[PDB]
Every structure is written in C-alpha cells, then in structure tokens.
Amino acid sequence: ASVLWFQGGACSGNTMSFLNADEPNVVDLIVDFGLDLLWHPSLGLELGNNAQKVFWDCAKGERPLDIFVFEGTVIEAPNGTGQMDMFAGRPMKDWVTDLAGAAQIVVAIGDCACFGGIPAMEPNPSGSTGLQFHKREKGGFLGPDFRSKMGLPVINVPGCPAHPDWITQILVALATGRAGDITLDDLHRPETFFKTFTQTGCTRVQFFEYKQSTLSFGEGTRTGCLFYEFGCRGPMTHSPCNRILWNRQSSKTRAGMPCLGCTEPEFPHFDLAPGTVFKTQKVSGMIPKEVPEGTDHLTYMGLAAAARIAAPQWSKEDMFVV
C-alpha cells in the first residue's frame, strides 16, 4: 500500500506525533506492515526533481497511490492562487487536487488538514482550509462530495496534533484487511477513536461528577476537574486522549492542562479570543456557557448542585499527590 504524505500549512506536529508511534512504531509501520511510504517531506530521501518525479507519477496515475496523507492546511492565499504554499513547483493546493483525485484513500491528519485548524483562525492570512471541512462546515478544499477511489470521503484524523495511534492504527487496519472495520463519524473521524470524549478516562471525572473544580495550576491540579475554571473542553470533545494516552504516559487533562477541544473542528475554539484561554466562560459567574455534550444547562446545573451537596470529602482534597 503506497503512501504519499504531503504537508501544506503544517507545523509537522502530526508527523512528529506519528513518529512517536508505538505498537506499531513508525519504522515497523513503514517497513513491516506493507505500507510503502513513497515520500514524506520530513522523511523522504528524494529531493528536487527525483521527489517531483515521485509526486507527478502519483498525480498522473503512472504509479498507484493507495493512501494520500495530507497534513497542514490547504493554503489558498493569495487570491485563491495558493502561492503562500508553493511545493515542488506548484501551489500545494494543486498537488492536493491531483493527489486526492488519484489516491485510493485520502487521510487528513491533524486539524489543519481536517478542518483548517490554527492557520484558519481569523484573519486566516494564508486562506487556509481543510481538505473536506472548513471548521465544522463540510466541504473544505475538496468539496463536500469528494470521494477517494475506494469511495471514502477524506478520513479526518483530527487533533493538533493527532495522536500517533489515531493514524497508525487506521493504517494497520488498512494494512491488515480491516478497512471495513473503520467507521467514520459525521466529521469523517474514525469512530474507534472519536466516539469517546477526552473526558472518557480522564483522571478528574470523579471531581467533575462531584463538581469539584481545580482552582489553580501547578499543585492546584493535584485535585479537581479543569472544566469549571480552566475551560476544559473534555466533556464536549470527542477523542480517546484519556483512553489511549499521549506518549503512552498522560494526557493534557491528566497533567492538569485543560483539553482545548483540538479534535473538534472549531479548534481553536472561540479563536482564542481574549478571556477564552484556560478559562471557563460563565453566565452570571456560575453557569458555564457550554455544558457537556448532550446535556442542557438546567439539568446540568441541577445535577451539579445535587453533586456539590452530596460531594464526598476525598473529592475535595488532593488526589494526585506526590
């Protein structure tokens, strides 16, 4: 299975995260799983005209392209020319057009590629967009009706960056005959990773249940949930970040950092407008503006009051102790 991994408006974080892959690690994925990595800007040996030969052979159908991985945004500025992202003699968006049209499967890795991500933040100088989404709005660069040659839409492996497993396990599934096991949600994300929430497996959910808030960073995060004071988007964000830990160690929320909802197409949420960074926007100083997914402010708040009154003592003390 040939893989061509291109980077548009990328920071290469998805590649670096991918390189952190374990079980399989990246080398075993590239070699031992029958995935022929044709080229990758961070890893491909070919430069210049040899690399362009590889790209053109993929684009024109001279050689098969099974998986086109795209990382980074599709940069369309200036004026829709895409010349703020010139790659191998073309605007990167033209490469995207050709290769997405050539690939059996197109995988957008990372929010930039999936939805536009950080570069698509206003004022979006690069005219960045995702492959098939611009933020939540379906269509992105390739249009809502784009399908790869295997009939799939762009497989969106979101995250900023995506966790290595979010792509590697998909690649293994494709390589092991389990492509049919891959189900995609409405954002084209693999449901095997994105039916759960970041909160799922969060070490602070018991504090969340009892509405015990982390009050401060550092040692303050030895207790409490980050939802109330730090804008944790865990309960509104689909991800397996607390199921499949980052770097096989931790997750933002475990570590005391609020989930920024990076697997969600709106990321960065509120465009990091003043007062929204590591803060919970609240109505009347008590009611979070955004409640967990599938809840309503009145039942949430009622249950929150009930949970506060019935809170056990341990939920009000440090638990992640030295």
Add this chain to the structure above:
Amino acid sequence: SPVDGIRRRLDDPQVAEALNSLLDHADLLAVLVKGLDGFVRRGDDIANNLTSAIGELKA
C-alpha cells in the same frame, strides 16, 4: 403476664404475616438506617458543601 400477651399477638396469623413481611424488607430498613447513619456521620461534610455552595452564590 403482659409479655405473654405480646407473644400471644405474635401467634396471630395477621400479626405474624405483617412481621414476616417486615422481616422480608428488613434489608431495605437496614440500608435506609445505614444510609441515615452515613448521612449523619457525613453531616459536617454536607454542611461544609452547603457552606461552599452558599459562599459561591455570595461571591
């Protein structure tokens, strides 16, 4: 004897039936009294929870 009379009431089919039904749901009564004991032994905590809740509405 008065105690003999309570034993006599215990013989009564209807009294016995009710006492047997009480002993059937005795686990519920036990758990509710245990729940009350728990609530009482954590009454200080629940009072501190109501204090922190009112103290938030104060701020």
